[PDB]
Ligand binder design. Structure first.
Ligand SMILES: CC(=O)C1=C(O)N2[C@@H](C1=O)[C@@H]1c3c[nH]c4cccc(c34)C[C@@H]1C2(C)C
Length: 994
């Protein structure tokens, strides 16, 4: 029964055929349990640690490398030699890296409390019911409550299901609906039905929502829905249906592996095809084995060289470091991958109150009727000073200070504000400041009467804490607050019934003090106050009052206005039913207009800036506020979302105007709008969806479970540090200070990160191209292998690892925020960066192969064979090119490889400095610009020596220390890369800018 709010208390009792006195019976209990299930949210079956890992080897590249480790194992076994001491390191290390990397990949789900699960924090363990099998209340497992039974809730309880209230035992029932919205202000319930069948939870004043708490009272209700059929459960389901897309980066990388996975394979085919000539070799000669083992060897090396094995660890470290860096700027990023996608942010929809504003309400303008006479009319406008809740400030007219007391209408105005209130001030000891106690809109009002002091009450005597509620406590004397009819969006006003304090048997004198939104209040006024006199509200004076309000709310002041009225001859206490808020407006009629107060919820001192920072960065900012369309547009201009005079006839909508437009125009409106006023519960989600259809990475703020869905959808769901728990667990980033500017700071910081990530990505992949050229060369020229996988790995993992990480601290661009949002379609390394990074590789290739062939031919300690065709043969089945030669095992000597490796390691340290900037010379951008980079380079080179001397390593890696002469040959064929890139860089700065 999900429309219980609109049905009568009797109707609900009938629907389920249950008695309010005994409740369901054990036969009804079982029958109900079998039809609706148990009252709880469905448990989660998290992915299996093995399932996750398995899915990581579901990747194409991880396979191509896996297979290799397999090709490596077969070879590692089908081999005969004394190098057996390290004949399995290769297929071992390969497989290992594959493990360590998969884990790192899976380290994106271990710890990440999600909303769909955090929602159990709100369902309680026990509930209280009245069942036919007893007279007293029994407290059963909430898990076992079903629709239709009778429950009981009292102050302190967490409502165990969606319950329709049957009767209120206490004087008034108060509920804390915070887990849904965020607002602590408890709400008042009633048992009277709510007509509208499609009423929103906020108007279902007769329902108690599962997961909420009883602030004050005791009540009895009939359970309407349970499990995933409640409000929270319905939200919990939306969550579960929300698909989560891969970050524009992941998508780009995942596609790179496809691109890479194809080439790798294509090259293993061009290799074979090149050695097809072997088809013309005597069967009775050579070897059908040395060929298969050779084609298989250079294939494995080929894969190992093409894949940047260190990338995963580098990206994961950069993002970890990147997270801590945001935290320093009060941006808690929960998802690592988010530190990346944050920079692609193209749209930011931010709530106003508290994010774009301080949420520190303050009254700074008010007016009463000065006089009415014929068509002539005059008001009495004022101004107040002090924006803090402190009772420190003053009232003044025409910038000149006046004493409020000297105005009667100001006394009344003051009386209402203090009587038709519900909050109060409180001076803090530690903080040493006055803290608001209750609604911010009210406290401001409380703070007002303390500044006005219409009764000249001597307060300068009183201490801080004493004068806090001084002037208020005084007004609370002149009248007795009988009862108060709560505020309801229905009539958007509220009132309190009062009677004079000094009065024994006086049956005349009671007054009702109304406070609410101007339109409603003012139309229920037949009289207008003028001092202490009163005269009929005439058409003119009405337009006068309304116009001053339009001004204060639509002008540069952007003030929230409250009209204040009083019912002079209120209905008799007896004739009022204080149980049907549907009658409250009626009670609040034939009113007299007393005054108007205008308060301000001031924009954060850093929003205008951050908004400008956004116009530059080409980032659209969409505000979502509670204000009306009029004040909303007005606030938008005030902070810059709109230009003072720019037309916004189609760039600002109110939830209502939005629902009127057809599903097509709504999509069109989401691409142009910048201001949403009075939005519906399901709008933020629709907004996010219509924005995503335009391929825009969206940031969406908001909290409480009503917002959870939207946040889950948006690419960057933002919660407040002071927000609900579920809001946070559903968001990608938390604002440790609730400040809009923190958002912007994070986008910039994400922009840095992506650029540096794009820097080291090219760094590494280029290193891979040089290696692939190196292998393919030593293969197309039948030369002996220059570099082997075990070496390449230590390179692409460590040597190249640290510097790539170092690049993480590369200084950001100064115009980092003065260029549009990176389209999630823009590729990584392409175009100029292809040719540019192709040549670097091709050089790196030739340079390594050359360094090998050199030692082999033009080296002293090396068996010179200049033009001896290392290509023409390696077979050595003739021994002709070395008649009196009894040694051919030098074609696998460690020296030449140690030459090839040293070249690569040196060239990469170089390119690491060439990588400080994409197109800037090291002249303008010295090496020491990035200290961490210089550090890693040393840590690497030295580590290069570690594997050349420490006995185990040098042999295991198949390397031998180099002579001070040979090393002189490395620098000779390494250092030059720095000039080559400077050239390509030069070619970009000058002949590539237009
Ligand atoms: C551009 C591109 O598609 C990719 C890549 O380029 N990479 C990863 C990848 O998916 C591969 C990968 C994922 N998980 C591991 C664990 C161990 C080793 C590897 C991987 C190799 C692949 C890597 C890191 C090069």
């Amino acid at each position: 029964m999900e429309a219980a709010h609109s049905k009568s208390t009797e109707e609900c009792l009938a629907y389920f055929g249950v008695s309010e006195t005994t409740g369901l019976t054990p036969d009804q209990v079982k029958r109900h349990l079998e039809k609706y299930g148990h009252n709880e949210l469905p448990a989660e079956e998290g992915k299996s640690l093995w399932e996750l890992v398995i899915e990581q080897f579901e990747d194409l590249l991880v396979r191509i490398l896996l297979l290799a480790a397999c090709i490596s194992f077969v070879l590692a076994w089908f081999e005969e030699g004394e190098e057996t001491i390290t004949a399995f390191v290769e297929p071992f290390v390969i497989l290992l890296i594959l493990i360590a990397n998969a884990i790192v990949g899976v380290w994106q789900e271990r710890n990440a409390e999600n909303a769909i699960e955090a929602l159990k924090e709100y369902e309680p363990e026990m509930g209280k019911v009245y069942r036919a099998d007893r007279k007293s209340v029994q407290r059963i497992k909430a898990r076992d409550i079903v629709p239709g039974d009778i429950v009981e809730v009292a102050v302190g309880d967490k409502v165990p299901a969606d319950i329709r209230i049957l009767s209120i035992k206490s004087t008034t029932l108060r509920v804390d609906q915070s887990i849904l919205t965020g607002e602590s202000v408890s709400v008042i319930k009633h048992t009277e039905p709510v007509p509208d069948p499609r009423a929103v939870n906020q108007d279902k004043k007769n329902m108690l929502f599962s997961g909420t708490n009883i602030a004050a009272g005791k009540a009895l209700g009939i359970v309407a829905t349970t499990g995933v059929s409640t409000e929270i459960g319905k939200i919990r389901d939306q969550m579960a249906a929300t698909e989560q897309d891969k970050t524009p980066l992941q998508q780009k990388l995942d596609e790179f592996g496809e691109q890479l996975s194809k080439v790798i394979s294509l090259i293993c085919v061009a290799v074979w095809l090149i050695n097809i000539g072997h088809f013309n070799d005597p069967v009775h000669g050579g070897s059908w084995i040395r060929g298969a083992i050779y084609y298989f060897k250079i294939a494995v090396a080929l894969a190992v060289a093409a894949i940047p094995e260190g990338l995963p660890a580098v990206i994961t470290t950069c993002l970890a470091l990147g997270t801590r860096r945001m935290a320093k700027k009060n941006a808690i990023v929960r998802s690592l991958p988010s530190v990346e996608t944050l920079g692609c942010t193209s749209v930011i929809c931010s709530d106003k109150t508290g994010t774009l504003t301080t949420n520190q309400m303050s009254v700074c303008k008010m007016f009463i009727i000065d006089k009415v006479d014929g068509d002539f009319c005059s008001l009495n406008e004022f101004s107040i000073t002090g924006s803090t809740y402190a009772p420190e400030g003053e009232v003044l007219k025409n910038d000149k200070p006046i004493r409020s007391g000297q105005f009667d209408g100001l006394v009344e105005l003051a009386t209402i504000c203090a009587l038709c209130n519900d909050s109060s001030l409180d001076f803090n000891e530690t903080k040493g400041v006055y803290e608001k106690v209750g609604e911010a809109t009210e406290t401001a009002l409380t703070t007002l009467v303390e500044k006005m002091n219409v009764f000249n009450t001597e307060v300068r005597n009183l201490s801080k804490v004493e004068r806090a509620n001084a002037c208020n406590s005084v007004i609370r004397q002149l009248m007795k607050k009988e009862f108060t009819l709560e505020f309801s969006r229905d009539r958007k006003s509220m009132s309190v019934y009062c009677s004079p304090a000094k009065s024994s048997r006086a049956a005349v004198g009671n007054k009702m003090f109304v406070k609410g939104a101007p339109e409603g209040v003012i139309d229920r006024c037949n009289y207008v106050r003028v001092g202490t006199t009163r005269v009929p509200m005439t058409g003119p004076v009405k337009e006068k009052i309304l116009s001053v309000i339009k001004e204060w709310g639509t002008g540069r002041d952007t003030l929230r206005c409250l009209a204040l009225a009083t019912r002079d001859t209120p209905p008799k206490r007896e004739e009022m039913v204080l149980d049907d808020s549907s009658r409250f407006m009626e009670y609040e009629t034939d009113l007299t207009f007393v005054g108007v107060v205008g308060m301000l919820d001031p924009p954060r001192k850093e929003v205008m800036g951050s908004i400008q920072l956004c116009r530059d960065a080409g980032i659209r900012v969409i505000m979502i506020t509670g204000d009306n369309k009029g004040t909303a547009i007005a606030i938008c201009r005030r902070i810059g979302i709109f230009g003072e005079n720019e037309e916004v006839a189609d760039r600002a909508y109110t939830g209502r105007e939005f629902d009127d437009l057809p599903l097509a125009e709504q999509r069109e409106a989401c691409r142009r709008a910048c201001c949403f006023a009075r939005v519906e519960p399901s709008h933020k989600s629709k907004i996010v969806e219509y924005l995503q259809s335009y391929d825009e990475i969206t940031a969406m703020t908001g909290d409480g479970v009503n917002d959870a869905p939207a946040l889950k959808k948006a690419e960057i769901g933002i919660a407040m540090g002071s927000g609900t728990a579920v809001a946070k667990t559903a968001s990608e980033m938390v604002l440790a200070d609730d400040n809009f500017s923190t958002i912007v700071a994070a986008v910039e910081e994400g922009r840095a990160i992506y650029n540096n990530m794009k820097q080291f990505i090219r760094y590494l992949i280029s290193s891979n191209v040089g290696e692939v050229v190196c292998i393919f060369l030593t293969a197309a020229l039948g030369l002996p292998e220059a570099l082997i996988p075990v070496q390449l790995l230590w390179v692409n993992l460590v040597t190249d690892g640290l510097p790539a990480t170092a690049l993480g601290f590369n200084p950001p661009d100064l115009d980092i925020m003065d260029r549009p949002p990176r389209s999630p379609k823009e590729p990584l390394i392409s175009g100029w960066l292809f040719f540019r990074y192709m040549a670097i590789g091709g050089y790196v290739g030739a340079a390594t192969v050359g360094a090998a062939a050199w030692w082999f031919m033009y080296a002293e300690d090396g068996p010179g064979v200049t033009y001896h065709q290392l290509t023409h043969f390696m077979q050595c089945t003739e021994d002709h090119p070395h008649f009196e030669g009894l040694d051919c095992e030098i074609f696998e000597a460690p020296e030449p490889m140690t030459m090839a490796l040293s070249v690569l390691v040196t060239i990469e340290m170089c390119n690491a400095l060439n990588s400080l900037s994409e197109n800037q010379s090291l002249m303008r951008m010295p090496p020491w610009v990035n200290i961490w980079l210089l550090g890693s380079i040393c840590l690497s080179m030295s580590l290069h020596f570690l594997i050349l001397y420490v006995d185990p390593l040098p042999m295991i890696f198949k390397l031998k220390a180099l002579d001070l002469t040979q090393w002189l040959m490395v620098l000779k064929i390494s250092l030059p890369v720095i000039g080559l890139d400077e050239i390509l860089k030069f070619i970009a700065r000058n002949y590539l800018e237009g």
